[PDB]
RNA sequence: GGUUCCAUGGUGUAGUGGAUAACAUAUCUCCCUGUCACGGAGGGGUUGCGGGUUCGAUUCCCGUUGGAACCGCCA
RNA sequence: GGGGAUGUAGCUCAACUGAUAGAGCACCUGAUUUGCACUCAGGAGGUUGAGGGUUUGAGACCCUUCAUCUCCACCA
RNA sequence: GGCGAAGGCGAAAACUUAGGCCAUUACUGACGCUUAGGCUUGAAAGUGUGGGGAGCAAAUAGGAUUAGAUACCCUAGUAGUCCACACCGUAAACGAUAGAUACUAGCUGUCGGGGCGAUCCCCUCGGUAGUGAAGUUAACACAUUAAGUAUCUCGCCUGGGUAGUACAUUCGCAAGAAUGAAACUCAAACGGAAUUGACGGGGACCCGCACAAGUGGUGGAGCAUGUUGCUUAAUUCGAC
RNA sequence: AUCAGGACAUUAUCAUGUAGAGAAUAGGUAGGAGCAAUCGAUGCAAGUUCGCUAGGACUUGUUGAUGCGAAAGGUGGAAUA
């Protein structure tokens, strides 16, 4: 019911979630691999992380906007296959800034696996 | 390590239908290197698919042979664990002779009788979508669908 | 890291997206496992003298 | 001196309200490896003694051994 | 004693207030392992407790019994 | 790349404050180098008292893996990591190279002051790097910032294991620090550098029925033959 | 004392609504067997009803002189003014 809106696209290492959200707060609807019924490690895989935006995309896309603004976040591996897919959806994509959280050097982070 | 791509021998067209693909399922039903008895059987069966269906032997054999070509290939590939699957899109020359073997292996299997009757009840069985080696395909291309994920990925 | 899509085509929004991007995986991977700070001083020398030997034979 | 518990394969333990005995380790044969350990497949091995009841006792009953756990106080 | 529940596959439980006999795990075969498992495909396994009636039809709705589960009172 | 003697120092500001480089027609006029003893500082961990505690994580609990896992992985998690005041005084505290002084080819960078005046670049005086001959070294290598030619002073070394152990002593609340042997034992040493091979669950490249793609088999049954074991008067001997 | 909220009762509100078969969403009974016409035909447009996504009834807009085989015709357990 509304034209514009902003999507939050999460790429964790392990697994990825996009959310549609109104451009300011109250998301309107998500989804996830967990959500979709890929479980375990193939969450964590560029395909799933289309597939994710694919589903999100068609039910986004009934529910009428055009102009999305694609906040991309996270550091995982399939960061543009979920990209693709929004564009093969055809919204309408205005923006492409990305807000993964960085530090100024604040807090430690934690060790290094072996 | 071999560098050299192997050369391929002639496939020659059939002596009677002249459709090739006959020679091959000839030479695929071979056992104990008899040229002259595997002849016989087979074309046996295209007499009993005459007497049978009422059509022309040679469109019910590509019809049957056509339909059950597979199209994803499924390649092993083992890293730490189990392998996970690589759906590839196997050549044209491999998608007849994969279909053959099937064809045969689940002919020499049935509870029919004589295999003259049991390998043309596999082609007849195989013309209508319903019989052994479809579900062979079916499970394959159910296998590599289910395991899209890691195409992307061969080596 | 805003970079508009011009609205004329799409490829190049992601074209230089993919630069962005990589330049802030690293810091973004940097602050992900604690390393001593003579090792984190050690892997400053070890990227910057990387950069500068090959920046060396492309000028 | 008295009272309660236990006795099952080679070793550690379950069951059976009478008709039936398994688990693990161990043992044997075969894959396995240069070999061996580990691993895989298959194979095998059982009611403390006695005496009664029952058609039938490891089980139910009374005695006899061995090993434990409790008590043996008031002067 | 009084009230409330249940009985559907080998093991648990869905159903659905009347028109499907199902889901899951155990058992079996196939793909797959160094194994052990996880995963993936297929398959079976039922007087739906018994008895009577409803309805054009029932496992279901109701009535009555059998068995177990709960409860909830108790000056011989 | 800069600064400090070393440890160390990187958001911004104020106050206090240390040393250093360049030019000196100025001044004192050998007042200088080193330093046993002594004093000061000295990463992190640790201690005592009082605060603080977001994140992380020794010790600890659980889930995995495993023949076993008190470990590597994951989820939690106290002391601690932080501040103030008191201690501890050890590190691969390394440039594995004590400080000071004079001399000895050169080339390429970079930083600061000074001279010229768009930068850039040239010269002078210093700091910090790379390459490089004479020279030195067992070799690797050092080479004007020496491990070169020489002088002064201090510290330290005298085969390996015992052993940085034991006793005594000083310091410390404590853990401990400093100092530091011997009996006994070996002919060498987890000695140094370099060379030829082998090997690597180190890389790069290339081969073969090796894997892959197929076909037909073997391991299951009966039989033939050979072997192991056992037996027997002998089951002749060898091949493993 | 007042305000707001949903509990559960309602004053008062009538479409709903989905065996097959039947042309049909069949909620059960329309008493029955033709009936409605400014007590206004018929027409198609918009929304809504709920869904058994086929269909349903209702409202709004066109709106004017014959519609109503849901009277009579239909099959069915259930039925046609
Ligand atoms: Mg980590
Ligand atoms: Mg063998
Ligand atoms: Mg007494
Ligand atoms: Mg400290
Ligand atoms: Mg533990
Ligand atoms: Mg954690
Ligand atoms: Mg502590
Ligand atoms: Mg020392
Ligand atoms: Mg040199
Ligand atoms: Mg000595
Ligand atoms: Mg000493
Ligand atoms: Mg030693
Ligand atoms: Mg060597
Ligand atoms: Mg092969
Ligand atoms: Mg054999
Ligand atoms: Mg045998
Ligand atoms: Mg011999
Ligand atoms: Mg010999």
Redesign the interface.
Same mark, same amino acid.
């Given at each position: 019911n509304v034209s514009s809106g902003i999507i939050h696209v999460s790429c964790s290492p392990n697994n990825t979630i996009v959310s549609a959200s109104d451009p300011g707060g109250n998301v309107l609807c998500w989804a996830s691999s967990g959500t979709m019924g890929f479980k375990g490690s193939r969450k964590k895989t560029p395909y799933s992380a289309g597939i994710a935006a694919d589903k999100v995309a068609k039910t986004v896309k009934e529910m009428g906007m055009a102009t999305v603004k694609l906040f991309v976040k996270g550091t995982g591996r399939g960061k543009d296959t979920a990209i693709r897919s929004f564009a093969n959806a055809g919204l309408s994509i205005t923006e492409i800034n990305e807000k993964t959280p960085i530090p100024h050097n604040g807090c430690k982070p934690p060790k290094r696996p072996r | 390590m071999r560098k050299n791509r192997a050369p391929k021998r002639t496939v020659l067209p059939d002596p009677v239908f002249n459709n090739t693909l006959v020679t091959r399922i000839i030479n695929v039903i071979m056992e104990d290197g008899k040229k002259g008895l595997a002849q016989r059987i087979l074309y046996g069966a295209f007499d009993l698919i005459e007497q049978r269906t009422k059509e022309k032997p040679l469109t019910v054999f590509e019809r049957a042979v056509g339909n059950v070509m597979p199209r994803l290939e499924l390649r092993v590939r083992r890293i730490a664990g189990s392998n996970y699957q690589v759906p590839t899109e196997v050549p044209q020359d491999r998608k007849i002779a994969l279909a053959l073997r099937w064809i045969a292996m689940f002919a020499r299997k049935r509870h029919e009788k004589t295999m003259l009757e049991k390998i043309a009840n596999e082609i007849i069985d195989a013309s209508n979508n319903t019989g052994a080696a479809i579900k062979k395909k079916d499970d394959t291309h159910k296998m590599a669908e289910a395991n899209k994920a890691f195409a992307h990925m061969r080596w | 890291? !805003? +970079?508009?899509?011009k609205?004329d085509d799409?490829e190049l929004?992601?074209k230089k997206? !993919?630069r962005?991007?990589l330049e +802030?995986?690293r810091?973004?991977?940097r @602050?992900?496992? @604690?390393?001593r700070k003579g090792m984190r001083l050690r892997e400053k020398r070890k990227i910057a003298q990387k950069k500068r030997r090959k920046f060396r034979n492309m000028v």
């Open positions: - | - | 890291p !805003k +970079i508009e899509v609205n799409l929004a992601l997206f !993919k962005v991007s +802030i995986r810091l973004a991977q @602050h992900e496992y @604690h390393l």
